[PDB]
Amino acid sequence: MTEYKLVVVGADGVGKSALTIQLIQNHFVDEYDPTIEDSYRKQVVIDGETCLLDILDTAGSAMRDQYMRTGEGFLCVFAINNTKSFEDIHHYREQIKRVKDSEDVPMVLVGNKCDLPSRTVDTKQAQDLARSYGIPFIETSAKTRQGVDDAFYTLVREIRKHK
Ligand SMILES: Nc1nc2c(ncn2[C@@H]2O[C@H](COP(=O)(O)OP(=O)(O)CP(=O)(O)O)[C@@H](O)[C@H]2O)c(=O)[nH]1
Ligand SMILES: CN(C)Cc1[nH]c2ccccc2c1[C@H]1NC(=O)c2ccc(O)cc21
Ligand SMILES: [Mg+2]
């Protein structure tokens, strides 16, 4: 079966771990336990194809160069109530594009914490940025699990399209 190496990137606190844990364990992590590095495996069925997801959950370096080279697809995560994390997105995309020496790298823009009321990043703002990059935009909530499977499965489909 096909294996997909996915990397979850973004500013410290956007919900990279909570999104990953919701995907893998169907569990919401309320606590804020900072990540050094953690990878997870999950067998899933996407478009009738049973495949293996190998997901790397990163810290919000030679180690960074290595996983960006290895990573087939990237979830660029920001929190919808955090303008600073949205402003950070281009820095992550720039690092990945530089390491992979490609303007065509499978990526998905993820607007997390969509369950929270005081939103500072509009859907239009996020959609316009994702459109300028030629990538999908998915609104997610690691709290309710809204859009979690969508973000990861969409990334897998972007990888399938690329190859
Ligand atoms: N309400 C709400 N809270 C969230 C959501 N996602 C994450 N959180 C909360 O934000 C905090 C940080 O989440 P975490 O997943 O640890 O973020 P992170 O980006 O991995 C932090 P680091 O970069 O240090 O590894 C946690 O308290 C978590 O419960 C969400 O979608 N909605
Ligand atoms: C192979 N799996 C058991 C673990 C795993 N899953 C991934 C998903 C996306 C990208 C990389 C990886 C890796 C590792 N492969 C590396 O090159 C690397 C560098 C730094 C790390 O912290 C981890 C890895
Ligand atoms: Mg984390």
Author numbering: 1 to 60, 65 to 167
How is this structure described in the published paper?
The 3 human RAS genes, KRAS, NRAS, and HRAS, encode 4 different RAS proteins (KRAS-4A, KRAS-4B, NRAS, and HRAS) which belong to the protein family of small GTPases that function as binary molecular switches involved in cell signaling. In the “off” state, RAS proteins are bound to the nucleotide guanosine diphosphate (GDP), while in the “on” state they are bound to the nucleotide guanosine triphosphate (GTP). The γ-phosphate of GTP holds 2 regions, switch I and switch II, in a compact conformation that allows interaction with downstream effectors, such as CRAF, PI3Kα, and RALGDS, as well as with the allosteric site of SOS1 and SOS2. Oncogenic mutations in RAS impair GTP hydrolysis, leading to stabilization of the activated GTP-RAS form and enhanced RAS signaling.
Based on the X-ray structure of 15 bound to GCP-KRAS, we chose to introduce a phenolic oxygen as a H-bond donor at the 5 position of the isoindolinone to interact with E37. The 5-hydroxy-isoindolinone 18 was 6-fold more potent than the nonphenolic matched molecular pair 17, with an isothermal titration calorimetry (ITC) KD of 20 µM. X-ray crystallography confirmed the desired phenolic H bond to E37 at a distance of 2.7 Å and, all 3 previously discovered polar interactions to D54 and T74 were maintained. Given the improved potency of 18 and the high conservation of the SI/II-pocket across RAS isoforms, selectivity was evaluated using ITC, and 18 was found to bind with similar affinity to both the GCP and GDP forms of KRAS, HRAS, and NRAS, including both mutant and wild-type KRAS. Compound 18 also showed biochemical inhibition of GTP-KRAS with SOS1 (EC50 = 33 µM) using a time-resolved fluorescence energy transfer assay. A dose-dependent decrease in phospho-ERK levels was observed 2 h after treatment of NCI-H358 cells with 18, leading to almost complete inhibition at 50 µM. Guided by the X-ray structures of cocomplexes, we were able to optimize binding, as evidenced by the discovery of the isoindolinone 18, which bound to GCP-KRASG12D at 20 µM by ITC and also displayed inhibition of the key PPI with KRAS in a similar range.
